[model samples]
Target: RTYTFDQVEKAIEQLYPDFTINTIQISGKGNDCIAYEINRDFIFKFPKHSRGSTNLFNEVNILKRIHNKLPLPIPEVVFTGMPSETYQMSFAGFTKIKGVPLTPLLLNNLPKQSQNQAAKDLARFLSELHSINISGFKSNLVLDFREKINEDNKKIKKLLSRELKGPQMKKVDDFYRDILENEIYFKYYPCLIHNDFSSDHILFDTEKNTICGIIDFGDAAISDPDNDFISLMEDDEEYGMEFVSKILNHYKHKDIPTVLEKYRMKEKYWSFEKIIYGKEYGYMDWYEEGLNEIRS
Candidate 1:
């Protein structure tokens, strides 16, 4: 939950030699690694525990590889610490982007005209992002939902074995079983997805009418483009089409409603699974926010 800025500063100094950790701040709240703002520009992201490093580093590497090739804006990665004695924890840093969060500036309390404009620009950014097909994220793709379910069950069983029987335990097993019955269409649909692309994670310069920066690819991955549609409010063909159309019209507009429907269901299934797993395991990061989204 917290990172030693002193150690991170030292690591950044050693890694770049030229650039130093100018400033450090806790960027991502609660569950995420406390963000380190460096060089008054580069931001160092240090994961609290170890499992998160792989995904963070994967995003950093992919960003570096497609720096100029990306159709949309992505943060610039300055450096990442190696697995050594100097730095015991994992860290990835990028230059800080100055702009407004799309939600507040564009979606929160904005004029209808501005909302449409921002939505269109955001869509274009998504289209371009999906164009880049790289394989650096291959390892994460191997992370199967079923496998996670099995692991979660194993952990829950240990707790249950300790004479734990209650609503929490009962709901956990029920949700776990429900998820196991659902199916996922993990077919050959390769796209550069910004795995987590809600409005908050997006930044836009309304004066310029373009996405200035996309914050977290922490879970950025190469999933079906249909999954990308889930980035907006709802994970259905109607909302997805509306969202995609807003952006694609500026570029190449093609209707994928028929195809999008199939994936919408897949995404919905994904939505259900993630929530249930979060409820049972009580470790899923996105669970609370997802519940909030549903309530709203």
Candidate 2:
């Protein structure tokens, strides 16, 4: 069973008969789910696979639990539905936050001071989120990157025989070796994180030159604080470092420098690994684009 658009619309109709949806379009898609924006202000989402339902359940609970404490707005779950013949897995609806994604293009449009403030705002959001007490919470998510590296190593060995060649070949091996050697870097300072707090999840209010919301916590987990900063470091040295430095300044953690250095090493490995995976499967343009990012 798949998370189809028609089923999502039908389910919405089933849930609320009078709430007419005049317009419906997919706002985005992630590895785990598809997001549909209905009537321009409400978002409906369904897991791409059945196994992701448990995470969706956790997402609903996490949002409900942490809705009030943070400065930035998060989704307010309007409805949660169980799997039915029409839909493969559980679905959720929430009022859309009022901002667009904070992309490189968007961030570049901001004044230098605004960019610094945006980074500080993000640091503050992470600081507040991690500070939340999880004593009674039961979500036991953990992202062990070493395990992922080991898994990728197995695939790399096979893919090397078939897809990767020449200099690209040695780069993959070195990437895997580096990952294995740096396992200690990931061992320190575990804390709760948005886990997938990439730019896409970060919403910006261009009018105010500030962060408006942090959406899509379906992948949120208890993980290394180091893990959260990996995305801010992947681009060119100037702007990326400016944001990274500001974030570290606002963030009180001591291990940040060491952890960020470790992630710098880790970031180099993604383009190689994604290209290998993409070639092996012959899908997902993200891998091809990743290779281009590494080149430029």
Candidate 3:
């Protein structure tokens, strides 16, 4: 998404006049917003489209609700500015969580003991986070698996029909059938879920050998517990199963085999969902990988 950088800087200056931003670096950009690190301490994000701004609004409220409850650090919004002629839409800013992305290289290079500790630390963090009481919150989002599964399956089938051979299509078709039939296999007790609990959003302190923070609450919502676990399994499959085992062991989720079974199934389905999303949104990078995964 293209964000006019000059307008962003101008908005930042106008919003926070006293804070002299000496070093402004484009930290990242993705499905939502263009992110920048200002003065090495604050993160300012400008939404790319209208939906991004809505997500920003939800994120700000969710952050406010859960900021102090979790053990690991999460972004606390410092400022939120409405759309202007200079700025495309509503934007949000926060004090930067001091850490680096928990990259594959970092995970691999860590000592075995630290790796295990990091796993346990993350498990504990998730346990604490998902247990929070969110009854009073109005902005809490929900992903209704019970109702949405068929809708999602239809989308997946439609997307795959264009690329899959008969046999491959039959396999995916069977998978979806099984998923719908066993929709009630895993029980649900909806609570706070960091819906995108992946490596990119997880920050680690290099020296501390543990998670420093969890960022990107853009997808936070009330959802299935397995929804959270899918990302862990995706990491396990991509990284190493052994490291994932450490986290799973520490997690000791009550649902156990059933939840994991759901995770595995959803992991496969999510690959297709990503491709469908990428296709619909013009993100070509994931299309090949998604096809490879569905066809494999």
Candidate 2, run of 10 with poorest lDDT: 233-242
Off by over 4 Å in 2: 1-5, 15-19, 50-55, 84-88, 137-140, 164-178, 236-239, 272-296
lDDT (Cα, tens digit) per residue for candidate 1, span 70-183: 555678877777763333436777878777776542453556676676666666677778776665555655445567667756764563443344665565577667657655
Give the per-residue lDDT digits (tens) of candidate 2, residues 1-296: 36566788887788788889899999888766788999999988788665466667678878888888898999999977786553444688887998888887788888989887888898898889888876656536666777777887776567445445567767767767876786565666566678777787888887888899989888777667766777666675323665776787787667666766777776776765676657654466856665675555
**Candidate 1, position 79, lDDT:** 71
Which candidate has the top score in lDDT? 3
- TM-score of candidate 1 versus the correct structure, residues matched by position: 0.69
lDDT of 3 by residue, 106-210 (tens): 888999888888888888888888889878766338666656667766787787777888988898778777877784543577788888888878888888878
lDDT of each: 0.61, 0.75, 0.77
The regions of model 3 sitting more than 4 angstroms off are 14-20, 83-89, 157-172, 184-186, 235-239, 288-296
Decoy 2 TM-score against native: 0.80
| Residue 185 error, candidate 1, Å | 3.6
Please state the error at residue 47 of candidate 3 in Å.
Answer: 2.2
Model 3's alpha-carbon lDDT is 0.77
RMSD of 2: 3.9
Superposed Cα deviation of residue 278, candidate 2 (Å):
2.9
Lowest lDDT block of 10, candidate 3: 233-242
Winning model by TM-score: 3
